[PDB]
Amino acid sequence: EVKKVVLAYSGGLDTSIILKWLQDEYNCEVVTFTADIGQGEELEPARKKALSLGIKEENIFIKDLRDEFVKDYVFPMFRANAIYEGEYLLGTSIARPLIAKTQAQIALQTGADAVSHGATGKGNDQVRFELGYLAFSPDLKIIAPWREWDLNSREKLLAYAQKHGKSPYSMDANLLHISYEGLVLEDPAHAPEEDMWRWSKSPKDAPNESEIIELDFQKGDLVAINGEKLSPAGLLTKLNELGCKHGIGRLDIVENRYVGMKSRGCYETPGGTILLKAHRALESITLDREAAHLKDELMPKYASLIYNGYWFSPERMMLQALIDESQIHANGRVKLELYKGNVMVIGRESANDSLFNVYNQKDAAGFIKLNALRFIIAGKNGRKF
Amino acid sequence: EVKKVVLAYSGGLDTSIILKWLQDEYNCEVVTFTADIGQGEELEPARKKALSLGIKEENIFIKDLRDEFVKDYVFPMFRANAIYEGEYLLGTSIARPLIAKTQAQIALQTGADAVSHGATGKGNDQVRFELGYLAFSPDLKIIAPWREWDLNSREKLLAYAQKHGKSPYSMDANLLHISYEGLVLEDPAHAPEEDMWRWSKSPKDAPNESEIIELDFQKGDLVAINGEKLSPAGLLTKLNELGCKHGIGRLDIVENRYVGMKSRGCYETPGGTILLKAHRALESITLDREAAHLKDELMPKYASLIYNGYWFSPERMMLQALIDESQIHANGRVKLELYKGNVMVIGRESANDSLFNVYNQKDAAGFIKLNALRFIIAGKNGRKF
Amino acid sequence: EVKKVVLAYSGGLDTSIILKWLQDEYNCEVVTFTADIGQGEELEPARKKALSLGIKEENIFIKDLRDEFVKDYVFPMFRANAIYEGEYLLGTSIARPLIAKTQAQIALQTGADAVSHGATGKGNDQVRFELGYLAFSPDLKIIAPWREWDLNSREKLLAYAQKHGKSPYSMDANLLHISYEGLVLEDPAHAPEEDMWRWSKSPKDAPNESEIIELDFQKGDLVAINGEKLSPAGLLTKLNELGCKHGIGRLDIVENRYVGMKSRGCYETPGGTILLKAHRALESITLDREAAHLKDELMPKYASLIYNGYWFSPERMMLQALIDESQIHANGRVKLELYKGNVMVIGRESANDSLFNVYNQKDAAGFIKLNALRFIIAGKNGRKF
Amino acid sequence: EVKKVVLAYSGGLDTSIILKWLQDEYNCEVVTFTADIGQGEELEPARKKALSLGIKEENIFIKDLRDEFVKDYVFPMFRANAIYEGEYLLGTSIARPLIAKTQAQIALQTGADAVSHGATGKGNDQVRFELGYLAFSPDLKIIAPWREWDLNSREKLLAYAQKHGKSPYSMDANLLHISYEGLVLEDPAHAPEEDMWRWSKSPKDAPNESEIIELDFQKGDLVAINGEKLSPAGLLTKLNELGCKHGIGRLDIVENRYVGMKSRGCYETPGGTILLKAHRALESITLDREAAHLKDELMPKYASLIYNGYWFSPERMMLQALIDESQIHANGRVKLELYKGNVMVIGRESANDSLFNVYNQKDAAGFIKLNALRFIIAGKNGRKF
């Protein structure tokens, strides 16, 4: 039995169908939650769609989470130079836990005993949402209609819609990336069609004039661009526009999913692609060698945690504590030249934290002698190469 | 006391000075060893310079090691997607052990009791050479004149040269990369001058027409390019020309050295930059997820081993065994589009080894339920987020 | 639809009930498979029980797998010094894949289209079995009656038995260990009762006279005990008797399960506890430092793979290749004194492979100087501790 | 040139010789520093020896660091279950940085421009001291007379002593352990003689009556023993006496040194051996699985850092932050039975933090199905085992 559900609501047809199914099947009050995380969608019409579908005004939640997304999710991940399978900048994965947590809290606030979502019943996304929910409200009933209902025909789905009264690609968009799947992308041996890419110019259409930019960092996080101190969303947005302008950040991979097998997708990560390059350059003059190398060793594990939906887990908090500690002296400035898909570092400096700033050749002799000991012992023991 | 030394000889002024110092100070027979590993230098004049300096013909060793470099050093490293500090493709580091081993073997073959080299007395390179020597011949006397002699003035160096009778950058070149240090590069806050780059076109001078290429892989190694089966050096050379043509592979970093602190260098890795991208794409459809992820986790450690000069070590052999085992089914074809600095994957396929090739939503429900158990137990124990 | 099933059959009441349920519900021919892996049970009566229950003679499979268990499963794992959560020697986990693989092969051999087992529907064991099955025969239908049937009462279970015609602890026994769960052990705050331990003397009842033993190793594996070369099962059995005699190998832990939460169990691993100590001692004089340390770093991951049921996986094969490569020169002899629960190393030696077998104080000065560089650079940059 | 040195002074003959050599060779004022860290030596006579040797009263520093040793060095390390090469509890390694840091601070306080120590010129200990010094005072001149002086004869050492006016084993003792090297221990194939062990009873001489103890933990650290809340030194001392009484904590290994090769040593770690066992038991009911497993994976790296002398390093601080974060909910009580060398866990409980505290068999089916997907995809692709 269930009395009141918080639904992740986009205003789209499928979650509108879900909204009606909740009211009828579980016979409950539905609460809607719509979040701005850089989708580039007007929030208002969702309220109106929700109203026309029977939601009470007070049960309609519209929240702008752009700044918080970049501040408490995006920047913290980039401290690690997190990249999944050497290519993927985790744009979908990093955004999920922000949504699930916020939804869980609205549930708590409204007294709602259940939450719900329109994620696929066989994709990564259902896992990401539910792990998040249970981190913040482990007593919540979880309703995944895609997994529950008998509505598994298109015809039996259209019929239901009737009874209860853009780009052709399957897309996920936020301040960090735009994702594309479906259509020709289904064949990983087939190239994408050019008109699919909606956000960034191609490097071919990007300007013939390169552009220099300067990025200021404080404790590993971006704080200014060309001397301009913006809000976190402000900063990532600016980098996006720069990346888009110059055709930066496109990616074509098949990736291993947490749930199911391999999947082919394309991604536009204009700002984040620039962020990663700059952040490495920052660390290169400001981080102790072994501190940087230790974080490199632990990065893939961290990237998989994020990918798989384990942002809100003890593991990840442990890894974050390590990561953050590495970032204390990561203060400085990086200079980059952008040109048709290229992010070239051309300068890095730091006002108080550069380690780029006696020992002699006899000292180096002794360092070599002691590292070579095991090789001499081994050689004498028959283990010559 | 020393009777006979094998010297790494380039024909340059400094190693010519070293050659004379060996003959006089240690009072010995010098053996010269010059190797082609893609430097783009004629080998012959080194023999002639060596002759004019008093080396016996039979003590002059000129060897072409290009194929072996790519086959037994370069390709094996790329199986790991090895990259140092997220940027450096290890062009200098990977080449060193091939030279040190070959030098050690000429020493053994000729009956030479010592080896020698012109590497700096305070750089990474001396370590790389000596670790290698002692892997193959741990009884060898090692003579590092840069560390030993009293010739530490330029004036006292010119005087010695007299008594015993191009690009301004400090460069290291081989089939994998060209390295640049010195001059304006000394200031990491200063951009490089455009005329420094000797190998690759800039992306600005690269053609306005993109180029498609197809790369065939067998067990993780490149075997063909556009259907053409070349020798290993042949293959890497072809990729180099493609990379150079399209302005691919440039890099500007400060890196942490094994010996000493941080150093600013620029690198041209045209072929290798393309290789890495393609190799990831190959693995993306042919490697089991956990096998790929495990290798990712161990990559930085492997990269540091290579960088620091530990190619010929038990560690690295252990890591290689793991790496190679991951590569057994890494057979297939990758398609890429090159354009002004960009290496875009546009297709990947495999004839017999693609894992891209039942479970339902109820199955996914149970997978979620069991992963979420610890979160529910934790939540009940007060550990809600 | 299913025609013929291979059942893991012990002759016990529950798998006898399962055998009858298979014949009736799936309406098929049942094949029985009983394996000796050190349970200390006579195999014969299982054949007779199977006959009385309607199994054809030719569908009764009785196999002795003791030698193979130790040779291809136990010894390979011990090369890694595998221990789960710093205590558990994986006795149950390591035995499972041998059973699942053998069962899968009998299935293939007999033309059987399904396999089945009596493992709990909510324990670790079902996972271990099924991962194994699908490694060897991925087309096999898997029938887990504990998960499938409507027989979830004890009364409805007794009724079924009727219609189709020792220690009180829940135990798992093999050549490596005996496991105990249930009864008083359910409370982790409660001590076990003394009469539970069936295999080993307590240290209190163990003799007042210590015993010296000598263990010979070849490539990391035990090959002889006190000069006696035995079969692999022979060797582990001998160590068991020695361990039992002296009250060695008892353990009391709660452990984290793969499936479900935490569980309290007791374990007797007499031979394996001695094996681990000796194997470390062997490595201490025969393994290169970094090779040993690298294997230590990767051990927990390897232990979890084994625990969770991923013996037959690409990951584990990769890790094994690394592990085995570390073992090449692991030849030698270890001497230990056993006394009332204690395994004390008192000697280790090696005939051709000991690295226990010049450098001076000035050399050490230079080694220190170069390692301390980063600390001096940091100190000058304000980062003093 | 050097004016004033802080010397690590024990009052022994060798550091008394060093004290006189400093005054004469560097022609400086010597400051003495003697620390109590559990050596079981009276501190007073060191002051008197120092006075008779010409040290000013105000330049004699006698400090009790027992509580701080356990609190800020020993307990923090045990949070990680740190053990080196699977055996060594790091008693020497963990104590060093406390001494080096304190010495560096006395140097700073007194205005001393140099520090000095009597550590061997070819052992691990010189490295540990100097890394520590430079963490706290990177400008300090470091004087290692063992590496510097021409006093490398015993006869030329006795002559110097004259001119300027117990157990036979080489031992290191502190609150955590006693170390033994030298004499018969030199041959790793030779057993130690029984009269060498000075701290703990042998298990043979240990009482025939077992003893139960209860250990309370708070955030991963010991806080009480049998209900008794003691100071940190107080706690470790109590555990030592318990361990010694029952013959617990003896160890015989060859270990790999940081500097030089392999070395054979014996160790008595009575309290620490008990601490480790109890701390694992605590974690077993209070730590999330993945948090515990992640810390296990990173333990050897952490142990090597400690061993090699890198306690005061960015790496170690990063690892500590991770380790400490794992310990937040590590509150509870462990019960153990001690008997003749054995540390048996017999109970563990926690008042508010135990995770030992719904899902069904159908849920487990779906968890299995999704983990087995890659095996089925692989099997269909020819990769059957």
Swiss-Prot record, chains A, B, C, D:
Primary location group: cytoplasm
Recorded metabolic or biological pathway in which this protein acts: Amino-acid biosynthesis; L-arginine biosynthesis; L-arginine from L-ornithine and carbamoyl phosphate: step 2/3
One GO CC term, this protein: cytoplasm
Highest taxon above the source species: Bacteria
EC number: 6.3.4.5
Coiled coil: none
Family statement drawn from the similarity comment of this UniProt entry: Belongs to the argininosuccinate synthase family. Type 1 subfamily.
Protein name as catalogued: Argininosuccinate synthase
Native source organism of the sequence: Campylobacter jejuni subsp. jejuni serotype O:2 (strain ATCC 700819 / NCTC 11168)
Lineage: Bacteria, Pseudomonadati, Campylobacterota, Epsilonproteobacteria, Campylobacterales
Gene expressing this chain: argG
